[PDB]
Design an enzyme around this catalytic site. Sequence first.
Site, PDB file in Angstrom:
ATOM      1  CG  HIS A 188      -0.244  -0.027   2.071  1.00  0.00           C
ATOM      2  ND1 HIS A 188       0.405   1.507   2.818  1.00  0.00           N
ATOM      3  CD2 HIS A 188       0.330  -0.900   3.514  1.00  0.00           C
ATOM      4  CE1 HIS A 188       0.876   1.196   4.296  1.00  0.00           C
ATOM      5  NE2 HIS A 188       0.778  -0.443   4.303  1.00  0.00           N
ATOM      6  CG  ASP A 189      -0.437   3.824   1.093  1.00  0.00           C
ATOM      7  OD1 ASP A 189      -1.107   4.675   0.264  1.00  0.00           O
ATOM      8  OD2 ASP A 189      -0.859   3.527   2.043  1.00  0.00           O
ATOM      9  N   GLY A 202       5.157  -0.331   3.484  1.00  0.00           N
ATOM     10  CA  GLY A 202       4.123   0.432   2.857  1.00  0.00           C
ATOM     11  C   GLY A 202       4.286   1.444   3.303  1.00  0.00           C
TER      12      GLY A 202
HETATM   13  C1  LIG Z   1      15.953  -4.795   7.756  1.00  0.00           C
HETATM   14  C2  LIG Z   1      14.304  -3.849   6.994  1.00  0.00           C
HETATM   15  C3  LIG Z   1      13.093  -5.627   7.352  1.00  0.00           C
HETATM   16  C4  LIG Z   1      11.659  -4.825   6.296  1.00  0.00           C
HETATM   17  C5  LIG Z   1      10.982  -5.426   6.082  1.00  0.00           C
HETATM   18  C6  LIG Z   1       9.805  -5.482   5.453  1.00  0.00           C
HETATM   19  C7  LIG Z   1       8.857  -6.444   5.053  1.00  0.00           C
HETATM   20  C8  LIG Z   1       7.167  -5.906   4.467  1.00  0.00           C
HETATM   21  C9  LIG Z   1       6.173  -6.575   4.466  1.00  0.00           C
HETATM   22  C10 LIG Z   1       5.108  -5.604   3.553  1.00  0.00           C
HETATM   23  C11 LIG Z   1       3.843  -5.354   3.999  1.00  0.00           C
HETATM   24  C12 LIG Z   1       2.853  -4.564   3.605  1.00  0.00           C
HETATM   25  O1  LIG Z   1       2.402  -5.125   2.605  1.00  0.00           O
HETATM   26  C13 LIG Z   1       2.231  -4.036   4.887  1.00  0.00           C
HETATM   27  C14 LIG Z   1       2.703  -2.801   5.803  1.00  0.00           C
HETATM   28  O2  LIG Z   1       4.079  -2.470   5.390  1.00  0.00           O
HETATM   29  O3  LIG Z   1       2.288  -2.191   7.062  1.00  0.00           O
HETATM   30  C15 LIG Z   1       2.679  -1.666   8.140  1.00  0.00           C
HETATM   31  C16 LIG Z   1       2.310  -0.123   7.463  1.00  0.00           C
HETATM   32  O4  LIG Z   1       3.605   0.224   6.238  1.00  0.00           O
HETATM   33  C17 LIG Z   1       3.033   0.549   8.767  1.00  0.00           C
HETATM   34  C18 LIG Z   1       2.683   2.413   8.079  1.00  0.00           C
HETATM   35  O5  LIG Z   1       1.101   2.903   7.597  1.00  0.00           O
HETATM   36  O6  LIG Z   1       1.837   0.154   9.988  1.00  0.00           O
HETATM   37  C19 LIG Z   1       1.771  -0.712  10.789  1.00  0.00           C
HETATM   38  O7  LIG Z   1       2.981  -1.160  10.315  1.00  0.00           O
HETATM   39  P1  LIG Z   1       3.569  -0.738  12.131  1.00  0.00           P
HETATM   40  O8  LIG Z   1       4.980  -1.655  12.814  1.00  0.00           O
HETATM   41  O9  LIG Z   1       3.611   1.128  11.874  1.00  0.00           O
HETATM   42  O10 LIG Z   1       1.894  -1.139  13.118  1.00  0.00           O
HETATM   43  P2  LIG Z   1       1.426  -1.227  14.122  1.00  0.00           P
HETATM   44  O11 LIG Z   1       2.547  -0.162  15.112  1.00  0.00           O
HETATM   45  O12 LIG Z   1       0.196  -1.187  14.123  1.00  0.00           O
HETATM   46  O13 LIG Z   1       2.521  -2.443  14.828  1.00  0.00           O
HETATM   47  C20 LIG Z   1       1.905  -3.534  14.397  1.00  0.00           C
HETATM   48  C21 LIG Z   1       2.185  -4.496  15.385  1.00  0.00           C
HETATM   49  O14 LIG Z   1       3.248  -4.804  16.593  1.00  0.00           O
HETATM   50  C22 LIG Z   1       3.473  -4.770  17.944  1.00  0.00           C
HETATM   51  N1  LIG Z   1       4.210  -4.692  18.114  1.00  0.00           N
HETATM   52  C23 LIG Z   1       5.000  -2.513  17.922  1.00  0.00           C
HETATM   53  C24 LIG Z   1       5.594  -1.951  18.302  1.00  0.00           C
HETATM   54  C25 LIG Z   1       6.703  -2.483  19.077  1.00  0.00           C
HETATM   55  O15 LIG Z   1       7.893  -1.697  19.395  1.00  0.00           O
HETATM   56  N2  LIG Z   1       6.215  -3.585  19.264  1.00  0.00           N
HETATM   57  C26 LIG Z   1       5.322  -4.444  18.695  1.00  0.00           C
HETATM   58  O16 LIG Z   1       5.341  -5.813  19.474  1.00  0.00           O
HETATM   59  C27 LIG Z   1       2.252  -3.978  17.940  1.00  0.00           C
HETATM   60  O17 LIG Z   1       1.581  -4.170  18.728  1.00  0.00           O
HETATM   61  C28 LIG Z   1       1.349  -4.642  16.592  1.00  0.00           C
HETATM   62  O18 LIG Z   1       0.681  -5.766  17.395  1.00  0.00           O
HETATM   63  C29 LIG Z   1       1.504  -1.697   8.989  1.00  0.00           C
HETATM   64  N3  LIG Z   1       2.054  -3.064   9.175  1.00  0.00           N
HETATM   65  C30 LIG Z   1       0.992  -3.384   9.936  1.00  0.00           C
HETATM   66  C31 LIG Z   1       0.918  -5.314  10.654  1.00  0.00           C
HETATM   67  O19 LIG Z   1      -0.173  -3.303  10.254  1.00  0.00           O
END
Ligand SMILES: CCCCCCCCCCC[C@@H](O)CC(=O)O[C@H]1[C@H](O)[C@@H](CO)O[C@H](OP(=O)(O)OP(=O)(O)OC[C@H]2O[C@@H](n3ccc(=O)[nH]c3=O)[C@H](O)[C@@H]2O)[C@@H]1NC(C)=O
Lengths: 263, 263, 263
Positions: free
Chosen positions: B125-126, B143
Site C-alpha cells: 500500500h501507498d 508500506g
Molecule cells: C531490515 C528491514 C526489514 C523490512 C521488512 C519489511 C517487510 C514488509 C512486508 C510487507 C508489509 C506491507 O504489505 C504492509 C505494511 O508494511 O503495513 C504496515 C504499514 O506500512 C505501517 C505504516 O503505515 O503501519 C503498520 O506497521 P507498524 O509497525 O507501524 O504497525 P503498528 O504500530 O500497528 O504495529 C503492528 C504490531 O506490532 C506490534 N509492536 C509494535 C511496536 C513494538 O515496538 N512492538 C510491537 O510488538 C504492535 O503491538 C502491533 O501488533 C503496518 N503493519 C501492520 C501489521 O499493520
Amino acid sequence: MIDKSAFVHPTAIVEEGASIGANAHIGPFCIVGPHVEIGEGTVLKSHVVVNGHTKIGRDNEIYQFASIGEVNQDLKYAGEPTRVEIGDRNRIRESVTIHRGTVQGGGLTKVGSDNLLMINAHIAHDCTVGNRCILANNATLAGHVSVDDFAIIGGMTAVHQFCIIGAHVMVGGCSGVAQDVPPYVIAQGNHATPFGVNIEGLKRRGFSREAITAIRNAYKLIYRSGKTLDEVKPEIAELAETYPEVKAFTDFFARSTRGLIRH
Amino acid sequence: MIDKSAFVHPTAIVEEGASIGANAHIGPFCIVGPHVEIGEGTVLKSHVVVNGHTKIGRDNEIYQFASIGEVNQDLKYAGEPTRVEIGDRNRIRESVTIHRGTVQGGGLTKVGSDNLLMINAHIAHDCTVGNRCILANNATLAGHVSVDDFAIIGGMTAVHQFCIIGAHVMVGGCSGVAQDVPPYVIAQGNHATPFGVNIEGLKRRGFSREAITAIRNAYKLIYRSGKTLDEVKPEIAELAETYPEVKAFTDFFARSTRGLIRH
Amino acid sequence: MIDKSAFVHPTAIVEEGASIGANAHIGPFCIVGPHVEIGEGTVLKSHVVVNGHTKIGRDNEIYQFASIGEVNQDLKYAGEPTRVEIGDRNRIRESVTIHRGTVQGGGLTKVGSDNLLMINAHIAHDCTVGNRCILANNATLAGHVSVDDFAIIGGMTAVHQFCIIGAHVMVGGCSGVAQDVPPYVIAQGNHATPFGVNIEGLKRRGFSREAITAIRNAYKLIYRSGKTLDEVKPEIAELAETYPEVKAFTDFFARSTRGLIRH
Ligand SMILES: CCCCCCCCCCC[C@@H](O)CC(=O)O[C@H]1[C@H](O)[C@@H](CO)O[C@H](OP(=O)(O)OP(=O)(O)OC[C@H]2O[C@@H](n3ccc(=O)[nH]c3=O)[C@H](O)[C@@H]2O)[C@@H]1NC(C)=O
Ligand SMILES: CCCCCCCCCCC[C@@H](O)CC(=O)O[C@H]1[C@H](O)[C@@H](CO)O[C@H](OP(=O)(O)OP(=O)(O)OC[C@H]2O[C@@H](n3ccc(=O)[nH]c3=O)[C@H](O)[C@@H]2O)[C@@H]1NC(C)=O
Ligand SMILES: CCCCCCCCCCC[C@@H](O)CC(=O)O[C@H]1[C@H](O)[C@@H](CO)O[C@H](OP(=O)(O)OP(=O)(O)OC[C@H]2O[C@@H](n3ccc(=O)[nH]c3=O)[C@H](O)[C@@H]2O)[C@@H]1NC(C)=O
Ligand SMILES: Cc1ccnc(-c2cc(C(=O)N3CCOC[C@H]3Cc3ccccc3F)[nH]n2)c1
Ligand SMILES: Cc1ccnc(-c2cc(C(=O)N3CCOC[C@H]3Cc3ccccc3F)[nH]n2)c1
Ligand SMILES: Cc1ccnc(-c2cc(C(=O)N3CCOC[C@H]3Cc3ccccc3F)[nH]n2)c1
C-alpha cells in the site's frame, strides 16, 4: 499425443501437440503448452502452468501454482525457442518457478532426478540442477547457476549468477552465495564462507572413512595450507590418485569461473 | 466496456464494469473486478487476480498467480475504496503482489512504466515505484516506500516502511534497507550501508563524465567530508548550479524522512 | 455437508464429504478436499487449495494462491492421514502455505485465531501458531516451530526446526532464528540475538507498569546477571510469586529444547 491411460481434468487446458504419458495426471485448472512433454506417472496437482519447449520425466509431483518452462527474467531474452529439461521422481512444490534458457547461455535449463524443490524455489534460465538436490523454501538461483549432485541449499538463500554449488555441498539458510562452492563443503553467511567438510552428509551417503579423511585433507590444502589454488591443484590431483572421491575437486576447479568462497 | 478487439478467455471472469482496451488479452482463469481498467495491448497470461479501483496502462505483461489491486496488509486499512495505478510496458512476473493504498497514506499505490517486477516482488500500500526500475525475486517493500526512477533492488531484499530508494540506486541482494538511500548510490547489507556511486549504471544511461564526477563529489560531501548533512546541503546545491544532475540530491533531501543510510 | 446459506462458486470444486458452514464463501477455481471443514462466514477468495484432514474456523479470510492442508515437505512423511487445525478470524494472505503434520511430530499443525499471515508465509508440518500473531511476507517456519500468542515475525525471516518464538516476542525482518526466544523479547539478526524487552508491545496490550518492570528484571536475570540459566530459573520463579506475568518465562523454559538465543 495424450496417452489413453492419462487423466486430463475437464477444466485443464492441454494444447494440441502436448505429449502426455501413460498414467500421468493433469489436475484442474492446469495449462499445458503444445511443446510440453510430460512423462509416465507424472502428476500436476492443480493450477500448474507448463509451457515452452519443456520435457518432464516420469513420476514427478508438481504442486499448485508452479510455473515450469516459462519465459525467463533475463532482459537479454527476446522470445527465442529455448528449452527446459526435467528428469524423474522430482517433488516440485507450490509456487516453484523453473524458467527456460537463453540463446546466449546455451538454450537449456536442466533439472535432474530425485530432487526436492521446496515452496517458491527459483531455477533461473540456463541453470543446471543435478540429482538428489534440495532447494529449501525461497531458495533462489540467478541465471547460469550449477547445483551439483546431492547439494542442498537452505531456506531464503540466494545464489549469484554463474556460481557453482559443488556436489554434496550444504549451504545454510539465510545466506548469499557470491562465489563458487567446492564439492563436499558446508557454506553459510552473507556472503557465504566455508565452514568445513559436510562430514555427516558423506557418512549418510556411504562414503568410506578413508574417503572422508582424504576429502578433509583436500579441504585443508585449499583453505588451511596458506598456499595458492594454483599450488594446491596438483597436490589435490596427487591425492586423487589414491582416493578417487577427491577427483571431484579437480573436476570442479575446471568448471569454476568466479573463484572460491573464502573466509 | 470490453473493446471488440480484446480477447477474454471463456474461463476468465471479467465483472461487468471492467474496462478492457483494444487488443488486450485476458487469459484463462483470470479474475478482473468491476473497477479495473486494462489498457491497450496488455496481457494477463492466466491465473491473474486484478481487483479494486485499479488502472493498468498499455503493453503490460502480467504473469500467472500475480495479485494486482488487492486489499493491502496494513491493519489500519478498513475496506475504503483506495486505488492502484500502473503505467505502460511493465513486466510483472509470477506471484507479484501489488496492493491498494490506504486512506491514511494518501489512497494510491503507483507504479510507472518500463519496470521489471520479478517473481514474488511485493509492492505494498501507498508505495510509489517510478520508471525503468527492477525489483528482483522476493524483493519486498513495506508500506509507503518510494523506489525512484531506474533504481534496482536485488533478490531477497526488503525495505522498511517510508524509506526512499533514490533514483539510479543499486541495492544488493540479501539486504535490509532501514533508512533512505540517496540517488546514484550503491547500497548493500543488513542493515544496508552505502558503497559508493553507481558509476556503471550512470555510464550505461548516458551520464557524462563531468556529471558522474560531480555526483561522486557530492557523494564525498555527504559521506567522506565528515560534515553534517545540514552543512553539506548548501554545498551540494552550489555544485548543482553547474551540474544539474546533482539537483537530484537536493530533491531527495526534501523528501527524506528517515535519515540517510550510513557506514 | 454444504450449508444451504453457503456460496460455492460454479467453478469451484468442493469434493463430496467436505463440510462448508453457514454463510461461508468458496470463490472461483478453489479446490476443497473431502476431509475439509470450513466454518461459518469463512471466505476463500479464489484460486485456493484446501485439502487433507483440515478444520478451519469461522470468519477467516483466505486469499488467492494459498495452499492449506497440503502434504508437508518433510522427507520422512509418507502420506499418513495427519491434520491441520485453523481457528477463527485469521487473515491468510496470497500464497501462504500451511502444511499437515507428520506422525513423527504428533500429527497436527495448528493455528489459533486472530492471526495475520502475510504473503508467502510458511507454516510447516507440526508447527503451533497461537493467537494474535503476525508473520510478515515470506516469514518461514521450519517443522515443529512454536509461535506463541502475540508474537510477531518480520519480513524475510526464517526459523529453524523446533524453535520456540515466545509470547509477545518481536523478531525483526531479515533475520534467522536458530534457538529459542524467551517471551517478551525483541530479537534480530543472523543468527538472531536478543535486544531487550518488547516494551511498546506490552504497553499497547495493557500490561501494567509493574508487570513490565518485573519482566525487564527477569530479562536482566537471564541476560545481564552473568549467572547460568539453572541459577536464574528459581530467581525468576521467585519473582513470579509477586508478578504473575513473569511465569511466562517458567512455562517457556519447560518447553525450550534448543537453548536460548544469546548475544
Ligand atoms: C531490515 C528491514 C526489514 C523490512 C521488512 C519489511 C517487510 C514488509 C512486508 C510487507 C508489509 C506491507 O504489505 C504492509 C505494511 O508494511 O503495513 C504496515 C504499514 O506500512 C505501517 C505504516 O503505515 O503501519 C503498520 O506497521 P507498524 O509497525 O507501524 O504497525 P503498528 O504500530 O500497528 O504495529 C503492528 C504490531 O506490532 C506490534 N509492536 C509494535 C511496536 C513494538 O515496538 N512492538 C510491537 O510488538 C504492535 O503491538 C502491533 O501488533 C503496518 N503493519 C501492520 C501489521 O499493520
Ligand atoms: C548475495 C547474492 C545475492 C544473489 C541474488 C540473486 C537473485 C536472482 C533472482 C533470479 C533472477 C533470474 O531469474 C534472472 C537473472 O539472473 O538474469 C540475469 C542474467 O542471469 C545475467 C547473466 O546472463 O544477466 C543479467 O544480469 P546482469 O546484472 O549481468 O545484467 P545487466 O548487466 O544487464 O544489468 C541489469 C541492470 O543493472 C544495471 N546496473 C548494472 C551494473 C551496475 O554496476 N549498475 C547498474 O545499475 C544496468 O543498468 C541494468 O539496468 C540478468 N538480469 C537482468 C535483470 O537482465
Ligand atoms: C538460520 C535459520 C534458517 C532456517 C531456515 C528454515 C527453512 C524452512 C523451510 C520449510 C521447511 C519445512 O516445510 C519442512 C521441514 O523443515 O522438514 C524438516 C523437518 O522439520 C526436520 C525435523 O523433523 O527433519 C528434516 O530436516 P533435517 O535437516 O533434520 O533432515 P535430515 O536429517 O533428513 O537431512 C536432510 C538432508 O540433509 C542432509 N544433511 C544432513 C545433515 C548434514 O550435516 N549434512 C547433510 O548433508 C542429509 O543427507 C539429507 O539429504 C526435514 N527436512 C527434510 C528436507 O526432510
Ligand atoms: C543453524 C543454521 C544455520 C544455517 N541454516 C540453518 C538451516 C537451514 C535449514 C533449511 O533450510 N532446511 C530445510 C527444511 O529441512 C530442514 C533444513 C535442511 C537443510 C539444512 C541446510 C541446507 C539445506 C537444507 F535443506 N534449516 N536450518 C541452520
Ligand atoms: C556480490 C553481490 C552482492 C549483493 N547482491 C548481489 C546480487 C544481486 C543480484 C540480483 O538480484 N540480480 C537480479 C537478476 O539479475 C542479476 C542481478 C541484477 C541486480 C543486481 C543488484 C541489484 C538488483 C539487480 F536486479 N545478483 N547478485 C551480488
Ligand atoms: C529496523 C528494522 C530491523 C528489523 N526489522 C525491521 C522491520 C520488520 C518489518 C516488518 O516485517 N513489518 C511487517 C509490516 O508491518 C510493518 C512491520 C511490522 C513488524 C515489525 C517487526 C516484526 C514483525 C512485524 F510484523 N518492518 N521493519 C526493521
